[PDB]
Amino acid sequence: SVYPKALRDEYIMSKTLGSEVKLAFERKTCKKVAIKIISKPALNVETEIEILKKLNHPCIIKIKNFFDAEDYYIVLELMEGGELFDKVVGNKRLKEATCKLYFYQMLLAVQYLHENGIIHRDLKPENVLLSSQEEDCLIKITDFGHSKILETSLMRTLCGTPTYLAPEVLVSVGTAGYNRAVDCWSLGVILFICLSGYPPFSEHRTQVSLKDQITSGKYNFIPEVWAEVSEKALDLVKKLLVVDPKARFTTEEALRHPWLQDEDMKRKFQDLLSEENESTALPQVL
Numbered sequence: 001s002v003y004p005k006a007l008r009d010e011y012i013m014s015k016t017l018g019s020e021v022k023l024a025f026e027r028k029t030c031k032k033v034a035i036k037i038i039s040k041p042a043l044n045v046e047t048e049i050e051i052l053k054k055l056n057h058p059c060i061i062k063i064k065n066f067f068d069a070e071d072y073y074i075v076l077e078l079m080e081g082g083e084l085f086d087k088v089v090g091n092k093r094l095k096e097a098t099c100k101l102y103f104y105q106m107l108l109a110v111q112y113l114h115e116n117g118i119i120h121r122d123l124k125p126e127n128v129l130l131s132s133q134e135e136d137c138l139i140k141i142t143d144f145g146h147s148k149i150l151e152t153s154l155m156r157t158l159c160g161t162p163t164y165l166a167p168e169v170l171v172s173v174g175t176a177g178y179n180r181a182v183d184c185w186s187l188g189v190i191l192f193i194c195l196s197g198y199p200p201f202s203e204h205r206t207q208v209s210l211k212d213q214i215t216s217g218k219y220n221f222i223p224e225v226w227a228e229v230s231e232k233a234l235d236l237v238k239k240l241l242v243v244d245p246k247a248r249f250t251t252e253e254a255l256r257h258p259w260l261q262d263e264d265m266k267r268k269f270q271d272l273l274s275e276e277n278e279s280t281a282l283p284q285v286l
């Protein structure tokens, strides 16, 4: 098959980056972009586009253009560093200071989403992108297909008498409003993987079921591997891998954790930030 005419009109398509995501060039600027192809569905796409249009944050990918045709085409910022996944697969591990730089950006991004009433719901190494091939770089969150936009139903229900209201609804009031905490769990797992080169929950060399490990919260701790890692880092992971969503660390609490009170790391991030902004900085009023 071929690409839609409206797309071909503005962009020159190119190689596959991930088998789907393609490299392409905007004709007007000769600049590199990334184009995500979603085969026809509608719903996930509708929300993803609507989310990407309204969000504006350095650690969240930006949408440049959209094409609704034989298939869906979403035009995004090209992230040259690729997926974080490819940096941690094959038991590869990142140096702790890099985990801190990356994770700090993940936390800001996800905090920003929660502030804006959005739950990602699919945080994984694959949906985290690096801006460059340098190991010191900006990261951006991607893939909002599974996202949720924020209990209004329950809220309406609590107005008025529960004369006819079922018990399980009232019981659900306790935990109502903590859906965002699933993102913090996911962050916890990502941080674990990054620090250790291996996953906290798997079926490899174990007879307890994946489900069971997770609900129990008994992650596979391998002291050999973790001796390399700080006690501060490990502590943060522990407060994110908390089974009770009400007790689990929020992004704010993670951001205040001692492991993240690291002025050098922050400085380096600011550095990479303004360096990215140089491209677009208009002179301003003194």
Ligand SMILES: NC(=O)c1ccc(-c2cc(-c3scc4c3OCCO4)cnc2N)cc1
Pocket: 017, 018, 021, 034, 036, 076, 077, 078, 079, 080, 081, 082, 083, 127, 129, 142, 143, 144
């Ligand atoms: N699942 C998604 O929504 C999504 C969106 C954008 C990207 C993305 C990937 C890349 C990649 S992947 C492997 C690469 C590469 O670029 C450098 C060469 O090697 C680049 N930009 C993107 N926006 C992935 C998934």
